[PDB]
Design a binder for this molecule. Sequence first.
Ligand SMILES: C[C@@H](c1ccncc1)N1CCC(NC(=O)N[C@H]2CCC[C@@H]2Cc2ccccc2)CC1
Lengths: 279, 536, 1133
Amino acid sequence: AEAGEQFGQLGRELRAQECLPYAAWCQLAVARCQQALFHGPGEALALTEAARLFLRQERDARQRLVCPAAYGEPLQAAASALGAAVRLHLELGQPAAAAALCLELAAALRDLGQPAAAAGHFQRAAQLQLPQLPLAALQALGEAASCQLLARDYTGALAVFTRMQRLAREHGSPAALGAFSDVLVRCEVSRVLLLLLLQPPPAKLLPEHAQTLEKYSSSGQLPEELFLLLQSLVMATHEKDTEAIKSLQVEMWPLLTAEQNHLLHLVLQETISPSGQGV
Amino acid sequence: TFSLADCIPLLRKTLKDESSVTCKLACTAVRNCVMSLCSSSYSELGLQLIIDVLTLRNSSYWLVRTELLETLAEIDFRLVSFLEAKAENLHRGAHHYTGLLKLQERVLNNVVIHLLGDEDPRVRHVAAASLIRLVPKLFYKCDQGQADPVVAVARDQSSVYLKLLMHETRIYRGYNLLPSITDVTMENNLSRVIAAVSHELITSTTRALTFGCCEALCLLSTAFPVCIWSLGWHCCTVGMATMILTLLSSAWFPLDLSAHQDALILAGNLLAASAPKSLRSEVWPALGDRALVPMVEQLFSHLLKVINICAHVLDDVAPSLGSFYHLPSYLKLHDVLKATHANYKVTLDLQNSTEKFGGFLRSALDVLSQILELATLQDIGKCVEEILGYLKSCFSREPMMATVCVQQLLKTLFGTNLASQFDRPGLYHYCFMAPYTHFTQALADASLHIRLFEPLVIKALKQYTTTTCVQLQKQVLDLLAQLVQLRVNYCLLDSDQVFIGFVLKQFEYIEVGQFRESEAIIPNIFFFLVLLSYER
Amino acid sequence: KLGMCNREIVRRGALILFCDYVCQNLHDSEHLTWLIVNHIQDLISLSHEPPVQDFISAVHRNSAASGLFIQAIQSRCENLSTPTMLKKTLQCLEGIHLSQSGAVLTLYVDRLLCTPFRVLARMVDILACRRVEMLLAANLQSSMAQLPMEELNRIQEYLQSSGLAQRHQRLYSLLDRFRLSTMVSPDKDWYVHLVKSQCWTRSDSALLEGAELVNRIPAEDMNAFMMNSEFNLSLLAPCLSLGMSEISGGQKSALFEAAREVTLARVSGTVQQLPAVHHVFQPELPAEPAAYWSKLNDLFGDAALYQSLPTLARALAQYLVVVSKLPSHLHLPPEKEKDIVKFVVATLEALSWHLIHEQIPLSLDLQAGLDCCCLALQLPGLWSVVSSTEFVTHACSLIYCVHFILEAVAVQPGEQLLSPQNPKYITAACEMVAEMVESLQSVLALGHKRNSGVPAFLTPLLRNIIISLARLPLVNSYTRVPPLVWKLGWSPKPGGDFGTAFPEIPVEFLQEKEVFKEFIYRINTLGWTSRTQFEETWATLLGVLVRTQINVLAVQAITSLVLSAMTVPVAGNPAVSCLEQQPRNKPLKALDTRFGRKLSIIRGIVEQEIQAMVSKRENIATHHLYQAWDPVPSLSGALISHEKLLLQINPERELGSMSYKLGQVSIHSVWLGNSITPKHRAGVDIHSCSQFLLELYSRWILPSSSARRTPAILISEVVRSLLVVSDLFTERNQFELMYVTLTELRRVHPSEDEILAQYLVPATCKAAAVLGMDKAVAEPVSRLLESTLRSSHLPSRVGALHGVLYVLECDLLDDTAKQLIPVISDYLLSNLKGIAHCVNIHSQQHVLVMCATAFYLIENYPLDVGPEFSASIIQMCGVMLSGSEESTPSIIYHCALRGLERLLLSEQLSRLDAESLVKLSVDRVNVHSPHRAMAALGLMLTCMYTGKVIVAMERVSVLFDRIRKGFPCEARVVARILPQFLDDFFPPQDIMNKVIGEFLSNQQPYPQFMATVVYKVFQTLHSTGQSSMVRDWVMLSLSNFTQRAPVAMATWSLSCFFVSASTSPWVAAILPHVISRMGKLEQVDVNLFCLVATDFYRHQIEEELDRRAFQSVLEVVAAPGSPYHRLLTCLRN
Ligand SMILES: C[C@@H](c1ccncc1)N1CCC(NC(=O)N[C@H]2CCC[C@@H]2Cc2ccccc2)CC1
């Protein structure tokens, strides 16, 4: 009624004063006031805005001035506020709104050196958006796969990339729909690079992975130049042709993204210096 | 001894000028010659100019940013993709870059869609307008219709000159029943653009980006209808109806009259696009797909509330299906609409077309009329009374769309609406073979509950003889023609035949050139008369 | 000149139409040959068009037309080198006329077979195989006409001259099939030649096996072997890594000593070829000097010389990454310090030169060059050289090359890196470093949106290099100046050794917040280069403490500056050091025993592999996997080796995370080192500092008497700063004031503030813990957590829980304070129940500390908590282990698993609890995630080593399945720990068939890994007297050995198996050589088979009559011309 407006006035006044540690707390006080009146959209916005202020403070202390003494303390309060708004959004329906907030929390966590935590939140957002917005879920899943690679969970990223490819074919088919075609291209290249890096045995080789690898022994929605280079990489890896992999690594550099270029670099590095020997 | 290549350094130098006035005029100069240079032997210089103007998106002058958007909308990216594919040292730039230019990706994402989040609404409007222009000219690899950019460019040249010379109950705006034959290439380009704009909408932390993304999506649904390009709007479809309806049931988005009315148009367009596949032949019994019933129910209920608020504001009275008192969010919307109309009351800008209260009311009535197509008498017959009451309040402000809304109610009431009536290519192909086959083939064929409307009907007849708006005047004849088509006897409407005499006396001014826009009203006048030749 | 698209449309379209016209008129053969000899490159590129498809089809039906097709391709095959263009060329060349089989066959091998694109290489082989097939299936005399005898000989000689004979066996066999239709004792001298044949080659296929081959040669000949040219320089880095494993085991490594002295000799030798006078590398205009820039072109442009630099940098980077923990005599000699700095600059210049005149260099080459620069700038001996006045051009060259490399990778054309009296290179380098420092926020921030253009393997390298470069005296003063100050009215007169010694920012400029934030960023990112610089910024920050956002920022900035002094290796260097860690867990007495020592050996191997794949390498900048180290100095000092900190690190700290934590240093460390009953780090007086804030903060918050009662934003940060700074306190009196600083402030501050209570509670609890936790202090602080545990603000609760961990750490709690244990212990269970299986949806930090104190409470004070709490926790932390990756993050999974490992290793666990926790060590071994399976393998190893035919059988089975259904990295680790595992818990008879049986299975995906397991197991019985054991198990398994489904796998396994069961020293030493040649059946493999076989059959056998059984078994499969028969005929005489 009136207390919420006064608390909102205090929050913006402290924001202009750049005392947002208390302004977001004030924006949490109005959210408590909205709870007393059960104003769904009003409480969701108040909890949401308080979270962004908390994210800014953590970003200010970890990006603007990168203070060593910081230990992600504003992040804890941000997650509680964002998690409450996600819970409130879900209860009154609106799964997209809660999923979007999960994306915001995941984006902050990714940008604060926590890829593993960000990947979990990105996967959660994809699950919420999947029933209604398959395209949005694939984008959220793609963010999760990037975060898993940042956290060096290569098999975890492979599972996500396999899931995105299966969903893109199911919800976007035959031939792709263009928007899903870009997803399929990204999954197909990333999965092959991850499969070549991990080299699963026949016991662990799933039919989805086996079918994809058989295709590289037609082009689908992959460019002919990239498809032939990807085919050559698979044969070179299987024949242990080190010189061919070096030549292909340079040749495929402009055609791949930085994330894919890092995966290709790992494949070449693993071929020359296998890991697990302790030396 | 002057060389034409001597202003290319001069244009680049003036682009990086300390003065925003010179930079804006330098972008205009680039706009004139960028496409001609890319189409000539100096293509590397035209491509260089495209690279150099990309830095203008960060300019503090709003006129410079809009000039960049207009300049890039002129660029045909099928030609650019061809030049990019055969450029070797231009990808390196001045610092030996290791990747590719990706000019189309940067222009589309880092400029055109990025500027949809601009703080200035004018830049957002130009960015949205430049998005529609770029869609037909985008090129993507692995396309069914065009494998390489050369085929893509040759398609456009042969689509005009080699176009063979040949020739050959009303559903609302956003409905398409017959299966359209759409271009597969155009479907892919539209699908890619929509996904990019859609992704920015949820991953938006600023109000400006949400405002600009909804406006761009709404304009795309007008240039490329959702009902026609169903495959370009995600897998008949609805695409992002729940994506947009979330913003309608928000706290801050509805309070922006510009973006609120853009979401309403887009939300109605998306639901109307699924009509043929989501009809059968409870609540809303015409909808075969029950997943969309809450979506239609929520949108239909929302429109009545905002129309009620406009009715309340116009009748300046302080605040069942269209009740909004018990919702604080709708109370906030009323205060915004009340202030906007109060400004309109004390001014006399009669020729203004960008007024927000009138445009919002026009859009709310526009979408309500469109939604009425998917309706039956059963699910609206209980709620037809206050809508007719609402239309009376808003009739004086917007008589054109009120008559359209009345007509849609008559279709639903009489069972006339859609819900009540249902049951490899390369250069050789595009340049010679396909035009020759079509031409030779054509040569071969050469050888061979109503009484509630009456208070709102006499207002339309009364207003016809007192206004100079031909759009309203020609809309009244459409309503009158429909009433006669519905077998409503004309004696009930024109009791003293005073309307028909006014129409006949209008011909004196029409045929001496004293009627300002007689050309707009003539087709409806004569169709109305020939329909009256049967009525007795 | 990109030309006109409209011209191209006509150009391709006219050719398409002309081909269609020719297809209608085959009677005239004038226009057909005109297109073939003038437009074959265009015909191939347009072969997907229907008219061109028929035109090529028409050519393939005419012998004369097909002949022109082949001749035209050979004349224009250079342009047909693109993989897309070459793919179309083969498609058109597949249906060509039969009469032209000889001509097309010659074209395939001569110009198209040898290609780096393997998919096209096998396409040529398939087509060439088909062409020969029709050649010998047609008329003989016609086939001879198509293939001249000289041509048939030349085609085969080129195949043998190149490697294509072995790469395409079917084609060569078909070529041979057509031709006949148309008519010693293995001594030391023998060993050295074998490794000579492998190590003196430019092959990188087997470097791990190659490194082990030279390792076994005599140490005296080691120096001559590696220093001798034509030795593979790619084996230098593996030799150092392999030699490091021996040194890390205490044993002196001759291989590392030989490789180190060879690496430095080659590094110095390369420098000698550089120009005498060095100039700053100019990526834009390298032409003003004439001889200098031409001397680089003939040097960097030499393929042989350029390829040496990254492979030499690989060895140097491998050497510099372990030089820190090397003994005194193996350190970097001072005389070679100058050469290495020159070598590092030259390698970076060569990579930039390769970037300018070619495409991007190889990622391994690029990584090796930046690895050397990153590591060299961290060594104080090397950094002092590059920071000297004499090497001013070298420092500028490093800045120029690093900036050039970063922009060539991340910055697209038309884009900028930052998105909104002295030589000219001196100021340009200053501006380049300042730009790159700003790039550490967006462009080079790992995981950032702007970092999407940089591959993940370059971001950690460039961050460390830039910080080290920004610390150079050439650019340090300029870089610390905020850019906002530069655009304002500040412009002093620089002057010093380089003319860029700018003074510190005047205090008036820091009053504005936007420039103070930038100033705080620069000092925090780069640290302080000296004590004088530390005192400068200390006084500068103090001057800011004289609207309150400046006050809050200065207090936070002071906290970081004082905290920066605790980093162990180099106090002020962020690029080299991380915050000091003093674990609260004492070393385990369960180890270092007769079985604990062996457990540490097998767990240390597993621990090293866990670190390589689960840890975020915060304190590691390069790519080297086995370089994990913890900042734990010996406060008896030097850093403690990671192998001596098995399970001592705090469980609540994630693996490899080195950021500040609330329990960073234990109260035990405070007592030992400062002599406290319940200082000058790197020449910086922090006693004056730490005491200064104590008095400053005491008057800052406590006194409510004068005017204003300082605002609410400032009070919270003071307690946060006081809590963090307290880690550096030295005297108990300093801990007395910090308690009394907070005691009244608790009662003068209203209790309706939650952001304030989150810092107050742990600080008072930490202060009381050091102060004694006596009766007087216990009661007021005991109530403090209880009022904080019931908080709507979650960080206030974990921070309070972190205080309880401090409170009950080692200060023996009073028996009157026994009321605090149940309030938390039940809270430990009350809040964990709702999240024990859903930790993901809840805050991760709370669970980590909640599970951390539970381990300490159970381990140290088992009586304070009932058996219900202890028994539940093992079950409670077991449900989170046995869960999906989505339901349990890896950090939470690893913390609980590592805690149980220490809990079970410690004997304080009850008998019922200990046996219960063993039973969940089996379910967690078969998981999809390699790291979760590897982590549970360590738990299984400890659960079973501590427990020491019925249960061991069920466990060694999972050690063999994991090899059969695991990744090569996974299986290599398990195979490494297998020989010791089988030797200890299993009698040699008990598990011997399984070892041999798993070596022979069609279900075995890694025979090469099991070969070492058989080797180590065989030699573990040979060297302990059971030399007759191994012979009995050979004759038993020979019958099974002979029947292996491949013939190549059968002969290779027998060669490997004879090596394992060999008594000769030079025969057991070529195991890596025969492992590397897996699947090959060349001549040398055959002779190797016979040679190692006689070493068994002739030298040592059980008895004479047992030799008949050896002969009889092999006699069964004695094929006419197989290696088995050649084996038989050698042993006949
Ligand atoms: C850039 C840096 C990094 C740091 C922090 N965050 C992001 C990136 N990182 C450092 C490690 C490096 N190598 C790596 O991951 N090898 C992986 C691939 C498969 C095998 C191996 C893991 C393994 C090792 C031993 C036994 C078994 C498994 C990649 C890049």
